[PDB]
């Protein structure tokens, strides 16, 4: 029974389309966070895991953010910069420019995060709440 939120929270409004999480980022003035994964995979698994079950982050992606999670590529390279891979987490600012300087701590995989990432995830968040003005 196909949902949207696909493992990644139960309790967020997720948007269904890059187009939708646009328009309500530029319009609420919230950062719009696109989490690209796939089901058989299981470091996608072990993350969206971990991120359904931490608070912080779900406080945020429910009332901080407008949340899309998708698995399938967008229309818009700028969400895969450095490669297709998965779990890949990007961050779009209100402005509808792509924050490619908000990273993980792989240099050649810069947007995905592993379970052991997620201090640096929050900090990432928080980072994108820092709108480009």
């Not at 997720?14 to 950062?31: D, I």
């Not at 910069?81 to 998965?86: E, N, T």
Request: aromatic share 10%.
């Amino acid at each position: 029974p196909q949902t949207l939120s696909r493992g990644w929270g139960d309790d967020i409004t997720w948007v269904q389309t890059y187009e939708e999480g646009l328009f309500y980022a530029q319009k609420s003035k919230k950062p719009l966070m696109v989490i690209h994964h796939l089901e058989d995979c299981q470091y996608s698994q072990a993350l969206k895991k971990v991120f359904a079950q931490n608070e912080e982050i779900q406080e945020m992606a429910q009332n901080k953010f407008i949340m899309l999670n998708l698995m399938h590529e967008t229309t818009d390279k700028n969400l895969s910069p450095d490669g297709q891979y998965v779990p890949r987490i990007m961050f779009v600012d209100p402005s509808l420019t792509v924050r490619a300087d908000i990273a993980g701590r792989y240099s050649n995989r810069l947007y995905t995060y592993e379970p052991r990432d997620l201090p640096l995830l929050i900090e990432n968040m928080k980072k994108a709440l820092r709108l480009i003005q």
